[PDB]
RNA sequence: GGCCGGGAACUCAAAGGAGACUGCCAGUGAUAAACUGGAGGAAGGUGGGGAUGACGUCAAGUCAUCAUGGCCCUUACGACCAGGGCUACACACGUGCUACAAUGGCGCAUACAAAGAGAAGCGACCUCGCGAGAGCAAGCGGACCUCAUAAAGUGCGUCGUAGUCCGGAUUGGAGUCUGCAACUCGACUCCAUGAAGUCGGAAUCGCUAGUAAUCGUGGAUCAGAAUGCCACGGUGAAUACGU
RNA sequence: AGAACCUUACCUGGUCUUGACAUCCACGGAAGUUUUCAGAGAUGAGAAUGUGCCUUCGGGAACCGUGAGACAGGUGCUGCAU
């Protein structure tokens, strides 16, 4: 490889924590390994839900899941029945009288994990990436993010030869440790290898 | 001036040169010594009979090199002459722990050889 | 003679901890001795970057385990019993001993 | 890292509870130094997949038994993706 | 191009003339060692980066395996001959 | 060696050994525990214990007290 | 009557009281002969205050710990120097001349991944 | 005996700031950039070391960490179990450690580190114990106790070139711990071996300061199993005419 | 970054074929605990206790054994498909 991961590196900077809990060696790997659990089946069950972030924390023996979502709708529900039941699954498979609470993620277009599941999300209905990566990339623009790059990878096309074009656009100064850069990823499985998306947002200094 | 025979140190310490005996060492060739009295800077043809004598027949007990490691040999023959695994390592020069043996066997092995 | 030790990750949030414990404890019945800063255990993980031969890499990790020895004095009967409704700042290990 | 050696780890870890437990925290007293006896040893013999040496202490991810680390549970993969993505607190990059 | 390491004057005299001396007959860190060697050579006998450092190294640079009781005294009775 | 105490068999042959020490001397049965020690009792038995391909017989002599069986199981047979 | 200075250098950490009179220097609640001196550790100490007019004229009292054998030797002198010059400000000027102002900022380096000293890349003879 | 009052000075501990900025001065340089020195300054010229790797380079490697397209076997290369493999040598070479010793080795008194870890845990004292150590068992989930006496270093004596007091392979008796179970294929020790190795061929590797070079320390993985890895410290060098 | 079994993907032998591992359908028995006997164990043949929360009376709430099927499973192969 060559690149750091921006997100990770900044966690001493800008970038905060996504989960926040103090806890002995003991039950650290436990609490760790039922975050895993706790997100993996949160994720999956939301997956058409613009999740952006899911923070995890334990204040005392009960942890609380703040999801960051686009759409609260779906999440809520009417009347908060789907984060209760959410809730249950989540406080069963943690161990913890758990609670799930909600914050809209305002501005979609402009998350890292949201535009990078959105192209995958439009990537695998059999369209042209050129158009739908564009749409990211143009879409950003209005709403700021004075610095972005939106790269796509392997398998670009029906065709056997990986392929792999970034399209940047702004600036992006990964080498500036404040630069507040919000990066995910994501892959697409197509019928035909694996497609996998990075994304940079550069939403100005610290 | 024999001590065990065989494996006489010569003009040196009595605890150290006398770890000369290859049937005792560093730790069970000082209490001989110290059995009668010695001093621990005789050179070793400096002795007295006083001190020789009273040694020779605390010493006569134990074993020499000379029949230690041939009273080693029954017990690697009346034992360990038969199929037995750590006998097959006494055999073709083997290490006898197990140890790496593509490699670094040479000594019972010996030198290079294809 | 109430021992308060906390833990957290980082200072920005046993700092905030700390001053909660100096300031609401320390109404009529406190003469808290300090948020005394004991020495910071800092631990190091050295894992290996790549899912396979590539070794020289090995990439460096860190946590550090601020902690502070707040330590009111006085067991006043309000302290012994204000000091329990705090439970503030969710990450942090608040051990309260006598 | 398969399901068929995955599942041997649950058979042994739930296997070796029990009877270390309920008879080597009994039996294994007695072959200690406590001053051994022939047929009673034997009963340790008859029970064989539970013991502490049974362990494979595979990733909690992946079920990879190799480069562990206890802290975490995971392996040297999973940790890298599982911490500089954020998900584990406290963690950053060590520069001294 | 830059000048040589500066080096601060043997504290047991105060002179400069001396600390380089005892760092090249020095050996794996071991200064203390190394006025056990020389000082008991010199308290008891009673460009400048060039061809004196290169000349004096000669001087270090026999003292090995010479085979007698002990070098620590040998350099001693080298150095007398050359003084 | 260093058990010192107990010199241990796995069960592979005290179901079969263990069990009929007393009847006699007869074909070899068939064991998986070479992981042993032959206790004195099994004098002229022939106890066939698996090396990896087959179950190799043992001839219990006494040159033995503390030694062990696998010992005369060999498996790295070359050449 | 003391005048103090902290002094300390690689990992050591002193503590050095100047007092008039009876020039003598007590290190650990130990005098330096016994506990630094007759090596190089013993004039070392007294470079700053033998250049300056000679100790019998101040009182020491040093109470150094952490680091080693030269270390300690060099927090000292450094411990002594910035308690004499709260003792005066007329040799401000000479120590830092002579050099015993400054204090060393050479640490030892951090062992880094990869290489065998941190500063010394594995053998690689034969390619 | 900081041991206790007590002091909050000081080290130290962890939070925040100030400080270094060719800032100033002289000179060079087009006056400039810049450089040369000096001053002050703790730090002087990005003061020091880390993290940070541009587009792309090798169809570089990984399908065995994982995911995955296609392909393949579904009373089966599937699966369980026991066993034994994986460590087997007759070698060719890396990477090392041990070293090959008289800046020394051995014996005695024997001072000064940092950095870490400890709950099926670090496990102290005492006793037994030649020891692997064992029995009892305080404390510690820890600037509170243990790991852990750091060696190197110092003082004296001694070993006098002896393939040796070095060096430890190899091999034996017994152990000591871990576990159903160690011989395959654990470690280490009590005792006992005690060889090969006295500097090694062209060649080549690393290194410009706390740096090479030593010596110890801890940690990961780990029932048990470091000459390896990671991190910590102590002692601590010499050189640079230039392309 | 750590091979006595396990480990370990290799093999010898024994064994199981909706499978050790996942879900679905049905039948039973609670599971669990104490057991023995043959085998090396996987298992098989038996012997006792329990039969627990609803029991809205079925059966769930769990698990175990079995029955046919879908399916599972693969450290199997291409890293020049990724």
Redesign the pocket.
């Known amino acids: 490889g060559?690149?750091?991961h921006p997100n990770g590196?900044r966690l001493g900077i800008v970038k905060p924590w996504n989960s926040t809990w103090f806890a002995?060696?003991?039950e650290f790997a436990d609490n760790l390994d039922s975050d895993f659990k706790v997100r993996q089946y949160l994720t999956k069950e939301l997956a058409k839900a613009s999740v952006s972030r899911i923070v995890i924390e334990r204040p005392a023996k009960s942890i609380r899941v703040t999801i960051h979502t686009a759409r609260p709708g779906i999440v809520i529900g009417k009347k908060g029945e789907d984060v209760e039941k959410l809730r249950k699954v989540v406080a069963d498979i943690a161990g913890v009288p758990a609670q799930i609470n909600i914050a809209e993620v305002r501005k979609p277009e402009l998350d890292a994990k949201l535009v990078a599941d959105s192209i995958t999300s439009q990537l695998e209905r059999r369209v042209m990436f050129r158009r739908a990566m564009k749409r990211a990339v143009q879409n950003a623009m209005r709403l700021g993010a004075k610095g972005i790059k939106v790269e796509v990878?392997?398998?670009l096309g029906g065709a056997?030869?990986?392929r792999?074009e970034?399209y940047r656009e702004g600036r992006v100064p990964?080498?500036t440790?404040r630069a507040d850069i919000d990066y995910n990823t994501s892959?697409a499985?197509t019928?035909?290898?694996?497609?996998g998306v990075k994304v940079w947002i550069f939403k100005g200094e610290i | 001036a024999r001590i065990a025979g065989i494996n006489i140190?010569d003009?040196?310490?009595a605890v150290?040169?006398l770890?000369?005996?290859?049937?005792?060492?560093?730790?069970?060739?000082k209490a001989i010594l110290a059995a009668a009295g010695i001093a621990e800077?005789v050179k070793i043809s400096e002795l007295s009979e006083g001190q020789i004598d009273t040694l020779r027949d605390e010493v006569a007990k134990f074993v020499v090199?000379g029949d230690?490691?041939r009273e080693?040999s029954m017990?690697?023959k009346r034992?360990?002459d038969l199929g037995c695994?750590?006998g097959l390592?006494?055999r073709?020069?083997?290490?006898?722990?197990?140890?790496?043996?593509?490699?670094n066997?040479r000594?019972?092995?010996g030198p290079?050889?294809? | 003679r109430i021992?308060i030790?906390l833990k957290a990750f980082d200072?920005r949030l046993?700092?905030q901890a700390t001053a909660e414990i100096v300031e609401t404890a320390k109404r009529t019945g406190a003469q808290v001795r300090g948020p005394?800063?004991?020495?910071?255990?800092?631990?190091?993980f050295?894992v290996?970057i790549?899912?396979?031969?590539n070794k020289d890499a090995?990439?460096?990790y860190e946590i550090r385990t601020?902690?502070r020895l707040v330590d009111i004095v006085e067991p006043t009967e309000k302290t012994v019993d204000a000091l329990m409704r705090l439970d503030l700042a969710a990450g942090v290990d608040v051990?309260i001993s006598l | 890292?398969?399901?068929?050696?995955?599942?041997?780890e649950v058979?042994?870890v739930a296997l070796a509870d029990?009877?270390?437990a309920?008879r080597?925290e009994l039996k294994?007293i007695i072959?200690?130094?406590n001053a051994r006896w022939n047929a009673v040893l034997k009963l340790?013999?008859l029970?064989?997949?539970?013991?502490?040496?049974?362990?494979?202490?595979?990733?909690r991810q992946?079920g990879?038994?190799?480069?562990?680390?206890?802290?975490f549970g995971l392996?040297?993969?999973?940790v890298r993706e599982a911490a500089m993505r954020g998900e584990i607190p406290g963690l950053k990059?060590a520069?001294? | 191009?830059?000048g040589?390491?500066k080096?601060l004057p043997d504290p047991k005299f105060g002179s400069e003339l001396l600390?380089?001396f005892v760092?090249?007959?020095?050996?794996?860190?071991?200064?203390?060692?190394?006025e056990?060697?020389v000082y008991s050579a010199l308290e008891t006998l009673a460009?400048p980066?060039?061809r004196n450092?290169l000349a004096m190294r000669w001087i270090?640079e026999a003292?090995?395996?010479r085979?007698?009781?002990?070098?620590?005294?040998?350099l001693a009775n080298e150095l007398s001959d050359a003084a | 060696?260093?058990?010192?105490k107990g010199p241990?068999i796995?069960?592979?042959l005290l179901?079969?050994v263990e069990?009929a020490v007393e009847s006699g001397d007869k074909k070899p049965l068939?064991?998986?525990?070479?992981?042993?020690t032959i206790f004195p009792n099994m004098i002229g038995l022939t106890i066939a214990v698996?090396?990896?391909?087959?179950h190799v017989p043992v001839f219990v002599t006494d040159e033995m007290?503390?030694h062990?069986l696998?010992?005369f199981?060999p498996?790295?047979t070359?050449r | 009557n003391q005048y103090?200075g902290?002094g300390?250098r690689?990992?050591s950490?002193a503590?050095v009281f100047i007092k008039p009179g009876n020039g003598k220097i007590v290190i650990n609640?130990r005098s330096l002969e016994q506990?630094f001196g007759?090596?190089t550790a013993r004039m070392v100490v007294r470079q700053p205050l033998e250049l300056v007019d000679m100790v019998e004229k101040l009182d020491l009292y040093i109470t150094v710990?952490?680091?080693?054998?030269?270390?300690?030797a060099g927090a000292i002198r450094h411990g002594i120097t910035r308690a004499l010059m709260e003792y005066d400000e007329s040799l401000?000027?000479e120590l830092?001349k002579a050099g015993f102002?400054?204090?060393?900022?050479?640490?030892?380096?951090?062992?880094?991944?990869?290489?065998?000293?941190?500063?010394?890349?594995?053998?690689?003879?034969?390619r």
């Open positions: 060559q690149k750091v590196i002995n060696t003991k990878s392997g398998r056997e030869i990986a792999t970034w990964l080498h440790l892959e499985h019928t035909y290898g694996v497609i | 140190p003009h040196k310490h150290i040169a770890t000369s005996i290859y049937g005792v060492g560093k730790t069970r060739s800077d090199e230690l490691r080693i017990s690697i034992l360990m695994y750590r390592r006494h073709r020069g083997l290490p006898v722990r197990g140890q790496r043996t593509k490699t066997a000594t019972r092995k290079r050889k294809p | 021992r030790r200072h046993i700092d005394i800063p004991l020495p910071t255990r800092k631990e190091r050295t290996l790549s899912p396979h031969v090995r990439d460096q601020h902690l051990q | 890292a398969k399901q068929s050696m995955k599942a041997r058979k042994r029990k009877y270390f309920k080597a294994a072959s200690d130094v340790q013999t029970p064989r997949d539970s013991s502490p040496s049974r362990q494979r202490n595979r990733c992946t990879r038994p190799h480069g562990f680390l206890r802290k392996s040297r993969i999973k990059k520069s001294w | 191009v830059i040589q390491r080096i600390a380089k760092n090249i007959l020095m050996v794996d860190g071991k200064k203390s060692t190394a056990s060697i460009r980066v060039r450092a270090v003292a090995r395996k085979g007698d009781k002990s070098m620590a005294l040998r | 060696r260093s058990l010192k241990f796995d069960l592979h179901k079969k069990k068939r064991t998986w525990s070479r992981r042993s698996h090396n990896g391909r087959q007290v503390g062990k696998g010992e199981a498996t790295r070359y | 103090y902290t300390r690689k990992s950490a503590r609640q506990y007759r090596e710990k952490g680091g080693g054998i030269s270390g300690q401000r000027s830092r102002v400054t204090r060393d900022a050479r640490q030892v380096e951090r062992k880094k991944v990869g290489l065998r000293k941190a500063r010394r890349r594995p053998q690689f003879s034969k």
